[PDB]
Amino acid sequence: RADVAQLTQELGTAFFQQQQLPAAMADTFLEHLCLLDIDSEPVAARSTSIIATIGPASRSVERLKEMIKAGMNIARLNFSHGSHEYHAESIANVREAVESFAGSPLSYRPVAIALDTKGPGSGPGLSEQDVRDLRFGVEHGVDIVFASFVRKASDVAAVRAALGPEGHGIKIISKIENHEGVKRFDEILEVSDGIMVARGDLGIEIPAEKVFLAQKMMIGRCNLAGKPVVCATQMLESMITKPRPTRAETSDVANAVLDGADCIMLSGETAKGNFPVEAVKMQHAIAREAEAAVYHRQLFEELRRAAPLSRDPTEVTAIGAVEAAFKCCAAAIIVLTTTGRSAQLLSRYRPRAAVIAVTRSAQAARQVHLCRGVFPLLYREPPEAIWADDVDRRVQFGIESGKLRGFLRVGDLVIVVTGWRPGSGYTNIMRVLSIS
Amino acid sequence: GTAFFQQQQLPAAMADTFLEHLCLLDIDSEPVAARSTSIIATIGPASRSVERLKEMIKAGMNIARLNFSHGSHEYHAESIANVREAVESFAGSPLSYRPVAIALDTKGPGSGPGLSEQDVRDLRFGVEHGVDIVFASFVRKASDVAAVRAALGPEGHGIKIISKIENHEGVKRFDEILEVSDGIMVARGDLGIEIPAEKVFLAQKMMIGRCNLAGKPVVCATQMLESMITKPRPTRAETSDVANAVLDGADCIMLSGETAKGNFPVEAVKMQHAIAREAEAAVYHRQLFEELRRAAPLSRDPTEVTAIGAVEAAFKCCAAAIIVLTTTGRSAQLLSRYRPRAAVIAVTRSAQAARQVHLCRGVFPLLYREPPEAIWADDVDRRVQFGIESGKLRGFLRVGDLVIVVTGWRPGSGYTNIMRVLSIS
Amino acid sequence: AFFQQQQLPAAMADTFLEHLCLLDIDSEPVAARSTSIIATIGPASRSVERLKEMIKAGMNIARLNFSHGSHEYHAESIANVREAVESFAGSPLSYRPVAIALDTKGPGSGGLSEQDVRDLRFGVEHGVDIVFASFVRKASDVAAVRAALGPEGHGIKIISKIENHEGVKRFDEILEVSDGIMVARGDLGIEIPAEKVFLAQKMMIGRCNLAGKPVVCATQMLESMITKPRPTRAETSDVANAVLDGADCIMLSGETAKGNFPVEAVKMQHAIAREAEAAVYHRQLFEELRRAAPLSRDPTEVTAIGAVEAAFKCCAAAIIVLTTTGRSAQLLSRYRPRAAVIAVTRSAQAARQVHLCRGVFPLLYREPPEAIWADDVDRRVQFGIESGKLRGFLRVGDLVIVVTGWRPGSGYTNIMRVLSIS
Amino acid sequence: ELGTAFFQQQQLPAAMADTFLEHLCLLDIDSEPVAARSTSIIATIGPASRSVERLKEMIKAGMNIARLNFSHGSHEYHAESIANVREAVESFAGSPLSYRPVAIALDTKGPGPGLSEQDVRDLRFGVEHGVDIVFASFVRKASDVAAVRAALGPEGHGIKIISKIENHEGVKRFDEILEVSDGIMVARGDLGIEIPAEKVFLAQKMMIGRCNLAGKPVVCATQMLESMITKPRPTRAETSDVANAVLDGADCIMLSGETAKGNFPVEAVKMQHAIAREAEAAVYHRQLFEELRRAAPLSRDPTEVTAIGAVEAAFKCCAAAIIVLTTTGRSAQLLSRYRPRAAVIAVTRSAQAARQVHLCRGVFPLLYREPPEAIWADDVDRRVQFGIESGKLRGFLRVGDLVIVVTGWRPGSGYTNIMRVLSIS
Numbered sequence A: 001r002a003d004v005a006q007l008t009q010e011l012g013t014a015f016f017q018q019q020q021l022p023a024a025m026a027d028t029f030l031e032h033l034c035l036l037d038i039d040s041e042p043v044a045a046r047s048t049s050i051i052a053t054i055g056p057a058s059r060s061v062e063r064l065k066e067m068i069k070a071g072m073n074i075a076r077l078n079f080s081h082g083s084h085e086y087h088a089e090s091i092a093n094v095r096e097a098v099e100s101f102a103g104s105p106l107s108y109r110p111v112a113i114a115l116d117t118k119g120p121g122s123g124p125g126l127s128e129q130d131v132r133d134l135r136f137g138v139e140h141g142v143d144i145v146f147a148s149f150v151r152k153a154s155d156v157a158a159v160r161a162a163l164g165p166e167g168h169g170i171k172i173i174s175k176i177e178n179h180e181g182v183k184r185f186d187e188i189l190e191v192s193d194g195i196m197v198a199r200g201d202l203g204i205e206i207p208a209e210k211v212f213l214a215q216k217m218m219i220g221r222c223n224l225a226g227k228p229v230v231c232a233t234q235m236l237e238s239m240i241t242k243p244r245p246t247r248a249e250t251s252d253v254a255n256a257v258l259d260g261a262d263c264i265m266l267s268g269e270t271a272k273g274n275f276p277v278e279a280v281k282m283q284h285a286i287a288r289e290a291e292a293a294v295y296h297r298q299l300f301e302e303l304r305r306a307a308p309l310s311r312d313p314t315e316v317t318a319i320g321a322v323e324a325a326f327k328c329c330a331a332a333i334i335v336l337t338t339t340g341r342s343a344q345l346l347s348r349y350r351p352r353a354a355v356i357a358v359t360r361s362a363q364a365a366r367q368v369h370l371c372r373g374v375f376p377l378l379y380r381e382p383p384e385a386i387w388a389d390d391v392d393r394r395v396q397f398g399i400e401s402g403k404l405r406g407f408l409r410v411g412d413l414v415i416v417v418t419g420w421r422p423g424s425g426y427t428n429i430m431r432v433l434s435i436s
Numbered sequence B: 001g002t003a004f005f006q007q008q009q010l011p012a013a014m015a016d017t018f019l020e021h022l023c024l025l026d027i028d029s030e031p032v033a034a035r036s037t038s039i040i041a042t043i044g045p046a047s048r049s050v051e052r053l054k055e056m057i058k059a060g061m062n063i064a065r066l067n068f069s070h071g072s073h074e075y076h077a078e079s080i081a082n083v084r085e086a087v088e089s090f091a092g093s094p095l096s097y098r099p100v101a102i103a104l105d106t107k108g109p110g111s112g113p114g115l116s117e118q119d120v121r122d123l124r125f126g127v128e129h130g131v132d133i134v135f136a137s138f139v140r141k142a143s144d145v146a147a148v149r150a151a152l153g154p155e156g157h158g159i160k161i162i163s164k165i166e167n168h169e170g171v172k173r174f175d176e177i178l179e180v181s182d183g184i185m186v187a188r189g190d191l192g193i194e195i196p197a198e199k200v201f202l203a204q205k206m207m208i209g210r211c212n213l214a215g216k217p218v219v220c221a222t223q224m225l226e227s228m229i230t231k232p233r234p235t236r237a238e239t240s241d242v243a244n245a246v247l248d249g250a251d252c253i254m255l256s257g258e259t260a261k262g263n264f265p266v267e268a269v270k271m272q273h274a275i276a277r278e279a280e281a282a283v284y285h286r287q288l289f290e291e292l293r294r295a296a297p298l299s300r301d302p303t304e305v306t307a308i309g310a311v312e313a314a315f316k317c318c319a320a321a322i323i324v325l326t327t328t329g330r331s332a333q334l335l336s337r338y339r340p341r342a343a344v345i346a347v348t349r350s351a352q353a354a355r356q357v358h359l360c361r362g363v364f365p366l367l368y369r370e371p372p373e374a375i376w377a378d379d380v381d382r383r384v385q386f387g388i389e390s391g392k393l394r395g396f397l398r399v400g401d402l403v404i405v406v407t408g409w410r411p412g413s414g415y416t417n418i419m420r421v422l423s424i425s
Numbered sequence C: 001a002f003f004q005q006q007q008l009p010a011a012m013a014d015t016f017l018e019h020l021c022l023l024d025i026d027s028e029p030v031a032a033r034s035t036s037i038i039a040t041i042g043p044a045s046r047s048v049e050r051l052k053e054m055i056k057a058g059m060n061i062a063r064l065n066f067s068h069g070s071h072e073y074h075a076e077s078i079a080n081v082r083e084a085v086e087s088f089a090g091s092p093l094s095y096r097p098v099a100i101a102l103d104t105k106g107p108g109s110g111g112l113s114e115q116d117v118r119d120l121r122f123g124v125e126h127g128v129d130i131v132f133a134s135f136v137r138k139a140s141d142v143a144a145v146r147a148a149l150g151p152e153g154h155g156i157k158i159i160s161k162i163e164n165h166e167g168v169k170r171f172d173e174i175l176e177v178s179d180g181i182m183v184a185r186g187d188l189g190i191e192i193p194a195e196k197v198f199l200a201q202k203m204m205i206g207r208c209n210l211a212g213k214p215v216v217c218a219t220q221m222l223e224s225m226i227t228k229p230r231p232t233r234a235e236t237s238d239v240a241n242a243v244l245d246g247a248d249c250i251m252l253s254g255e256t257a258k259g260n261f262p263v264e265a266v267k268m269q270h271a272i273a274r275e276a277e278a279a280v281y282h283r284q285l286f287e288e289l290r291r292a293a294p295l296s297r298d299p300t301e302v303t304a305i306g307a308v309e310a311a312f313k314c315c316a317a318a319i320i321v322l323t324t325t326g327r328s329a330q331l332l333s334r335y336r337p338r339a340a341v342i343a344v345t346r347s348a349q350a351a352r353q354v355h356l357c358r359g360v361f362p363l364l365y366r367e368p369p370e371a372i373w374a375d376d377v378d379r380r381v382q383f384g385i386e387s388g389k390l391r392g393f394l395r396v397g398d399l400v401i402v403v404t405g406w407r408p409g410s411g412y413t414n415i416m417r418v419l420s421i422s
Numbered sequence D: 001e002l003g004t005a006f007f008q009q010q011q012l013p014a015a016m017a018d019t020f021l022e023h024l025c026l027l028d029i030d031s032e033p034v035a036a037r038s039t040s041i042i043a044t045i046g047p048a049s050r051s052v053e054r055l056k057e058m059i060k061a062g063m064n065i066a067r068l069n070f071s072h073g074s075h076e077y078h079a080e081s082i083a084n085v086r087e088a089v090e091s092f093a094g095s096p097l098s099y100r101p102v103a104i105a106l107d108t109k110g111p112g113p114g115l116s117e118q119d120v121r122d123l124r125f126g127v128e129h130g131v132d133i134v135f136a137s138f139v140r141k142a143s144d145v146a147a148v149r150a151a152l153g154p155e156g157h158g159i160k161i162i163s164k165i166e167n168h169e170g171v172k173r174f175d176e177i178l179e180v181s182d183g184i185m186v187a188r189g190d191l192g193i194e195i196p197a198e199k200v201f202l203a204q205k206m207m208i209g210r211c212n213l214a215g216k217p218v219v220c221a222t223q224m225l226e227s228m229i230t231k232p233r234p235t236r237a238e239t240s241d242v243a244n245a246v247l248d249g250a251d252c253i254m255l256s257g258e259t260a261k262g263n264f265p266v267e268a269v270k271m272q273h274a275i276a277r278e279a280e281a282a283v284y285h286r287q288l289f290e291e292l293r294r295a296a297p298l299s300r301d302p303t304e305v306t307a308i309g310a311v312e313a314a315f316k317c318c319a320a321a322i323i324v325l326t327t328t329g330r331s332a333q334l335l336s337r338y339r340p341r342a343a344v345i346a347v348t349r350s351a352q353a354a355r356q357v358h359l360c361r362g363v364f365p366l367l368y369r370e371p372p373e374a375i376w377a378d379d380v381d382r383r384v385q386f387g388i389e390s391g392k393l394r395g396f397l398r399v400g401d402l403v404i405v406v407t408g409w410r411p412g413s414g415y416t417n418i419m420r421v422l423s424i425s
């Protein structure tokens, strides 16, 4: 009790009963489980991003506005079906729906566009259709590529080459779908930006009863590497026809979040199903409950112990900031980022505090949805003459936007992460600020 | 040998952190141990045939559930007769005979405040037909359990009562319910309609953790392989759900419509068997055993003291099994609560105890039918030899394996106090 | 080569047993000695020439035992210590602040005695930094010492000496109102059974470490060195184990006050302390200290834990902190970082007093204030870095953690920065 | 059942702590030790401690092993010292409460490029006079131990060789020396002159840790209570040194000049006894047992498997003792390696094994001299009851207490494989 007594007196007992905080303070994993409480309500914003596949059930601008409101963060275009003309219209409709909320900069939500490739088929590597589809992706400014049937490091090098010199900023998420991809996982992860556990094909390529082992291992290795991992396929399958999911489906979504997935996905549930918006709402509801049930006490200790020593100041600042956020139960960590990297390094330590990422890059704002707990804020104001004033204005934008979006209140403590000079790669400062 | 240490997720078992444990899980590391989590299959039109019941026993069914929400007493008496005929068709080979428990699942209170009149009549039918277990529907408080116990009468004192937690009140009054029950069922069907669907996993994980702390059986139930009612293969969420219920700590997993009315009852049992075996090997025993030991209170009961010593000894030598003699099942239950990797082979003369111990994870019951030897120590040795010979035939044991043998100092229940390290010859 | 020094193989061990098995007599210490040495001043160590050698040997705090000697005798001891200290001020690098501590005679058969009231008044008038209060039995004893120091002695640190059964039993209430504790083993070993003193020592050190308050281990640590040039095997073991237990300071009494080898006794404590500090099992220690320290909304407390976590992540050579009272350095010290805590301060008294906290290396800044406050902060940080390089704490390519505040005055530390040296 | 008073004694609040920091914070000077002193005391015999009357007082004060320093004195002088020790020990044979075996250890003069001529002759004298242990001076490599072993002739292969590590080479070649030795002595006198004085604590803690990991006895020696050669009370550093050697994990602690030539030999023994008892209660068994368990490799040796099961069982019930039957002392040594809080009462027919087991922390030997029963199980039961009755007489046991009993399945050394939980009647 002494470790939380003064803060319980200051913040109140009501604060410490919410968001599974009694289970979070437990000394063992067994006690953590025993203290999980269905009456302990989640308070934090939902941190695991939702990827929704766009199809006939979710293609209209009106339907896409409801999906964005329900929680969709990434729109997936499955290039296994449909023409380039069909996908270009889907992209235009997503952008029209997203930009319909841009009139209010303090609330606008960026939505990433991901292109999922058809795959190699019977071939040994990059197919001719994939080369044409990847060129379409670059020409239409997609943010992410979900590369199908990645079996080795040379497969991701071929995808990177097909994106050309103009597609250097596109994130490549390698889909692991067969035995070879699982066995060569380390070499694939090393050259990829992240991984997708593509359970549909994986469950037919390897015994169905072994898929959970591959999922848990790949999520663990991605968490260790600090790279995004997506759990995909049949998560809420019965909602293609029914308005409510099965008990196994809610369990599956909760367990993917507890395992450590940065993103969760919907395929037929949103592409062709009867209830696309309800499927997004269900993933949102479960993910929020599961995030609060994470046992941060052991998780943070293990992430620190396993993460190798680092001389990179962004990495050093990130661990200091996450430690500081846990010490004061900070509502948020506000970070300035150009590429998203400083926010990704905070996310890898799995803070309970929201990572509010302020950026001028529209593409980085879309791409950071791949990292658990990163909430992108697109800053549109022109630069101040004095760089230090421009930094301060962006920090104040994060604080004000946070206070006007549900994140912060007067008296809260916030951790602020910034750098010593302009340009990417120089994050080195952590500050503790009291919200006024 | 190096081959031994590559199987049953042993590289992941030796990891220093849970994160490293996850990183070392290997799809090529094959399970070797017998499947420890019992399978409960609900009986119905798809699984009432005596021939179909034989295939379900072979597939891995350990407990047959009779759902009294449907069907008359005459229907349920025929289901019981059919199950017993199928089970006893294998009695001619005592070394491979598999006991199968019969569980009666009550209709419930309905709109009433407590034990309904139909439940009183159904519980009396259960006692008259010798059922082993009662799955009591909609248990909301300790007095509900007392009412079930009273309705079983003086002849049903040995029947196990597993309380079904199906609503908010049952979750909130969980501790008082568990204290007077033999175990719990996380009845997710009704629970998922009584409380928000997105909160069921919290109730499941909490109840399994509390049952594991108490050393009492816990069952995970409903929609685990739902799509297999009409499809030959389950969804990715369904295999994940079964694996995660085992990893959470469930002693039993259940099939309802999948075996009672579906077109793939045998395949649904085979699928639960396959997933449970993989998940049991992926349990992180290093932290689990440390936490169970630390949370279990100090005890002056010799059965409890012997049980923790035997589990510790089994881990030290990678014992293939812990062979235990038991009259009521209690000595096997106390070994099971520490979650040994070694199979707990329980030798008993009680047909009812042999059926009931399927409620405890990792207990493999063997029904001993031979009349007693005149010298008690020789009778004890003959039962231990029966455990060994049954284990060899079934694949649990081989020549050269080490086993831990748990027995007592006098006949009768309650006197377990001896642990012995034995080499299989 | 880096990973073979300072017991780093033993530091990376997964269990305390493996940590012990990996301790290596060939693994040389590299870090600066963190546990301060308190030397009692007497006839063997009173001359200016002897005091210069004691400062060079490692003495950080000079103890004046008011159980013997007149006020005139102690005033001369103080003047000699200050003269020896300022003789190195010509070349600040060898300049090291030395605290002056007054150890009271005690209550005797009486609370606060009349002689103690007069001696505490003398302490305030002569600007002593610390009071070692004898025979503290309860919180009201500390309040009486505080009252006797008056309004001019508010800044003096009170270290309560626990010397009997009552002091041990009422430890929590005494620690709550004290700045720190001294395990006064001489009287403790006669007041309670001799075989129980180690229990009282280990308990008091553990509770002081939990509270983040300084604790001193004292008496008969190197006793045989009063007449012999080398200590016994039990004496070297005792010094090493006091450091391993968690003592912030170790002390010499007769060994330096009247013995034949005062300088050698200081050199021996320095040598043992450096070896013992490298043998600390930081892997479990940091985890336990980090878990036990309560959650806090105080920005200095929040910044301190963030800075120590950052230092461990990059094997930082030092944490440079700006401090007025020493508090920001004390909050970093409580987490027992392997990185040296280099404390830059303008307060000469704070520079002397921070020797009470393990691993705090004070640097006295004496330059005029810059017109722009941000530039004055930058100049002090640069002074910490350049002094760190000159003194051997830092080298090109090292990473340092820098801890500062958002406005002038004590209590506003809230910033941690990661900096690469040259 | 036990009472709140029981849980306030022997540092039990500090023993139940979840962290080492909380363990330290809970150490209490008012919590009195209750268990018998487990760390043996080795006293060096000389002019101050040679008379039969003085030796009787030293045995009463707690001396378990008598050390003969062959660096000084003739064979005739040492033979008379041995005769005086045996006469003093046998003067207590009339009382089963006061009788205690005392081991005799020969400490060699030392090396020269091989074993010295004087050491060959002194080792021969040791075999001829039936010494139990050799403390071999200046052991630098495994071949030095082989030379000592060869010098123990055809008759002294059962004598224990404790290698003294006294220089840099001995520390660097520690692993190869420990592998071939029965145990180690941290000989701090010479070690503190051969290596820098400020590094001796590192060598001590490393060697104690490695011996504890190997399950072999380790002795801490020299200048532990040095000032007591001329003063009636020790310094604060000296009491701290003795307490810290016990906390480090030393099986034995030693007195040299303090008992051989000092003015207070009996008081020095009394002081080591008093400090050792306090320090043993302050051991943090919770983390120590977990680490010893985790570091000890997996084993298929039934004696090793039984030992860890017995120690686990003893902790579960706060057992008053673990009674073990042993012929060579090995089964008692394997229980001792896991550092149980319970006393290990070792019943043996070997007078030599009874003296030698004083090298292992917490082993209390009982020499059994009854003629063997014709029925082996009756002979085993008689010895188990002999251990219980001796435990009652000595104050370890009372009616209602639980004890753990360790035996084997057949006669002869090497077959330990049984652990039983017994209630004292």
Ligand SMILES: O=S(=O)(NCc1ccc(S(=O)(=O)c2ccc(O)c(O)c2)cc1)c1cc(O)c(O)cc1-c1ccc(O)cc1
Pocket (backbone or CB within 6 Å): A029, A030, A031, A033, A220, A223, A258, A259, A260, A294, A295, A296, A297, A298, A299, A302, A303, B018, B019, B020, B022, B209, B212, B247, B248, B249, B283, B284, B285, B286, B287, B288, B289, B291, B292
């Ligand atoms: O800290 S964690 O949340 N949990 C660590 C943890 C510790 C012990 C065990 S046990 O020994 O098998 C076990 C199981 C049930 C018992 O009743 C019990 O006593 C012990 C299982 C997990 C975490 C840590 C990680 O490093 C990580 O990568 C991910 C996660 C995690 C992964 C999966 C989740 O379902 C939730 C979180």
Ligand SMILES: O=S(=O)(NCc1ccc(S(=O)(=O)c2ccc(O)c(O)c2)cc1)c1cc(O)c(O)cc1-c1ccc(O)cc1
Pocket (backbone or CB within 6 Å): C016, C017, C020, C206, C209, C244, C245, C246, C280, C281, C282, C283, C284, C285, C286, C288, C289, D020, D021, D024, D209, D212, D247, D248, D249, D283, D284, D285, D286, D287, D288, D291, D292
């Ligand atoms: O992390 S620590 O450095 N050491 C933690 C530690 C862990 C276990 C044990 S044990 O279970 O008794 C033990 C003893 C010997 C064995 O062979 C073995 O396997 C286990 C002893 C220490 C530390 C932690 C603290 O929180 C603290 O306040 C202080 C210290 C400490 C204090 C005194 C020291 O001698 C060194 C450090």
Ligand SMILES: O=P(O)(O)OC[C@H]1O[C@](O)(COP(=O)(O)O)[C@@H](O)[C@@H]1O
Pocket (backbone or CB within 6 Å): A314, A336, A337, A338, A339, A340, A341, A342, A343, A417, A418, A419, A420, A421, A422, A423, A424, A425, A426, A427
């Ligand atoms: O996360 P990234 O991509 O490294 O960006 C972090 C960068 O953002 C900043 O905080 C502000 O930089 P800009 O003013 O160029 O936007 C830098 O100081 C820091 O290097």
Ligand SMILES: O=P(O)(O)OC[C@H]1O[C@](O)(COP(=O)(O)O)[C@@H](O)[C@@H]1O
Pocket (backbone or CB within 6 Å): B303, B325, B326, B327, B328, B329, B330, B331, B332, B406, B407, B408, B409, B410, B411, B412, B413, B414, B415, B416
């Ligand atoms: O697990 P339970 O019901 O306590 O049964 C254990 C009992 O079984 C035995 O091993 C054998 O007893 P029986 O010969 O009566 O079958 C007893 O020694 C022991 O008390």
Ligand SMILES: O=P(O)(O)OC[C@H]1O[C@](O)(COP(=O)(O)O)[C@@H](O)[C@@H]1O
Pocket (backbone or CB within 6 Å): C322, C323, C324, C325, C326, C327, C328, C329, C403, C404, C405, C406, C407, C408, C409, C410, C411, C412, C413
């Ligand atoms: O450790 P303390 O006593 O709180 O002092 C820390 C203070 O030192 C500073 O870094 C510098 O303050 P000054 O300019 O007044 O010396 C402040 O920003 C901070 O509040």
Ligand SMILES: O=P(O)(O)OC[C@H]1O[C@](O)(COP(=O)(O)O)[C@@H](O)[C@@H]1O
Pocket (backbone or CB within 6 Å): D325, D326, D327, D328, D329, D330, D331, D332, D379, D406, D407, D408, D409, D410, D411, D412, D413, D414, D415, D416
């Ligand atoms: O410790 P040791 O020397 O192996 O002796 C243990 C032996 O003692 C016994 O318990 C009793 O044997 P004995 O009857 O020959 O004395 C054996 O069963 C066991 O093998």
Ligand SMILES: O=C([O-])C(=O)[O-]
Pocket (backbone or CB within 6 Å): A148, A175, A177, A197, A198, A199, A200, A201, A202, A232, A233
């Ligand atoms: O491609 C996919 O998403 C799959 O197979 O799951």
Ligand SMILES: O=C([O-])C(=O)[O-]
Pocket (backbone or CB within 6 Å): B137, B164, B166, B186, B187, B188, B189, B190, B191, B221, B222
């Ligand atoms: O009753 C049940 O089995 C349920 O509701 O899950």
Ligand SMILES: O=C([O-])C(=O)[O-]
Pocket (backbone or CB within 6 Å): C134, C161, C163, C183, C184, C185, C186, C187, C188, C218, C219
């Ligand atoms: O007063 C003291 O310093 C003592 O008793 O140790």
Ligand SMILES: O=C([O-])C(=O)[O-]
Pocket (backbone or CB within 6 Å): D137, D164, D166, D186, D187, D188, D189, D190, D191, D221, D222
């Ligand atoms: O020989 C010894 O005992 C020593 O040197 O300490």
Ligand SMILES: [K+]
Pocket (backbone or CB within 6 Å): A078, A079, A080, A116, A117, A118, A119, A148
């Ligand atoms: K595709």
Ligand SMILES: [K+]
Pocket (backbone or CB within 6 Å): B067, B068, B069, B105, B106, B107, B108, B137
């Ligand atoms: K029912």
Ligand SMILES: [K+]
Pocket (backbone or CB within 6 Å): C065, C066, C067, C103, C104, C105, C106, C134
């Ligand atoms: K004094």
Ligand SMILES: [K+]
Pocket (backbone or CB within 6 Å): D069, D070, D071, D107, D108, D109, D110, D137
């Ligand atoms: K000698």
Ligand SMILES: [Mg+2]
Pocket (backbone or CB within 6 Å): A148, A177, A198, A200, A201
């Ligand atoms: Mg696919």
Ligand SMILES: [Mg+2]
Pocket (backbone or CB within 6 Å): B137, B166, B187, B189, B190
């Ligand atoms: Mg129901």
